[PDB]
């Protein structure tokens, strides 16, 4: 027989979506464009392209949330606040996003492409520029479009 559910349920989608918004990973849901926005405090160490060991659990319900949708291209892009220069900053955020997409295709996505890139605070979501990775500007964002 053909399958009713594709290894996913809508109750589990909104259960992970409430749990990610309770742990502060903000899931925006516009049309079929999905955005999960992750503060860089909640994954890495400060001004580093290196994961903390506990933050792979945060990546676990990120990846188990990304199980649930039929998707074609995830793009993951990272940007933080200014530390030395924009050149050092863009090298940091490129390594940052490529490390988290290396873990995300180590884990389960059914995406066909993950595009991955980093920017040098070129798109900052607040004008308040407190510090390093504790800034809410300092973030990675994982955006995709849910196919059909």
């Amino acid at each position: 027989l053909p399958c009713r559910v594709d290894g996913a349920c809508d109750a589990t989608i909104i259960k992970m979506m409430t749990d990610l918004n309770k742990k502060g990973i903000k899931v925006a849901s516009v049309g079929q464009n999905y955005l999960i926005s992750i503060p860089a405090s909640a994954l890495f160490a400060d001004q580093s392209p290196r994961l903390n060991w506990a933050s792979y659990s945060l990546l676990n319900e990120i990846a188990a949330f990304l199980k649930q949708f039929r998707k074609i291209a995830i793009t993951v892009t990272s940007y933080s606040s200014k530390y030395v220069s924009v050149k050092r900053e863009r090298a940091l955020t490129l390594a940052r996003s490529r490390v988290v997409s290396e873990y995300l295709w180590s884990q389960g996505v059914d995406s066909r492409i993950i595009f991955t890139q980093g920017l040098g605070s070129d798109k900052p979501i607040t004008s308040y520029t407190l510090g390093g990775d504790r800034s809410p500007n300092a973030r990675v964002e994982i955006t995709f479009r849910r196919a059909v």
Binding site: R4, D6, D10, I14, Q68, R70
Partner: protein, 70 residues
Amino acid sequence: AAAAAAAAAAAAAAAAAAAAAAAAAAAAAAAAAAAAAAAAAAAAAAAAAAAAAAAAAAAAAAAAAAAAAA
């Protein structure tokens, strides 16, 4: 089915079922993009079972003998 968002509002053809918050993960019609990757048929991916035979072996319509199903 479309659980806990709301109940299922419509059933959008050429798509999955449409819950009364968003689009669900449960397939509405037969002709949606359900991820079949393991078929279950005699002489699949050669041509089909040539149905006129009544013998021991199972012959495909591309005249191969399906020895895995005879």
